[PDB]
């Protein structure tokens, strides 16, 4: 479709915030209730469900504050850089946002692993099936969100 190579850091940052950050902040606020209900109704007979509320919660958290770092601190440094402005600290700023991505990543591996690649049992209720659906979706979206930053946005500045 549109080759991101032509997008300058400024625009690439904008797209990421309109396509990935903003839609995700809400997705959580809308998905979290369902993930909590599942660990109360079915957690007792299915421990993995209790383990996921946790993982999901700690993922949501890591992702929520890692995204808010990119908006309150790191994107400015990135646009600053594109405008040939002395920043000096960007080399490591990228190396922190890269690690942050590996962290929030292995967490997506566990959730998939716990959910048996998001494949419900024979006893999954609608909510259960719905959660798995919404969750699997939240995995690929962020996989696109992170890939874009890693292999395009960050590489531009480099
Ligand atoms: Fe981001
Ligand atoms: Fe990020
Ligand atoms: O992110
Ligand atoms: Zn079972």
From Swiss-Prot:
**So which residues are the signal peptide here?**
none
Mind listing the UniProt keywords for this protein, alphabetically? Cytoplasm, Iron, Metal-binding, Stress response
Record-level GO BP terms: protein repair; response to nitrosative stress; response to oxidative stress
Where does the record say this protein resides?
A: Cytoplasm
| The organism's place on the tree of life at top rank | Bacteria
> Which is a Gene Ontology cellular component entry for this protein?
cytoplasm
Query: Which Gene Ontology molecular function entries are recorded, alphabetically?
Result: metal ion binding
By sequence similarity, the record places it as follows: Belongs to the RIC family. ScdA subfamily.
Q: How does it assemble?
A: Homodimer.
The UniProt function text for this chain reads: Di-iron-containing protein involved in the repair of iron-sulfur clusters damaged by oxidative and nitrosative stress conditions.
By what name is this protein known?
Answer: Iron-sulfur cluster repair protein ScdA
- Full-protein residues shown here are 67 to 224 of 224
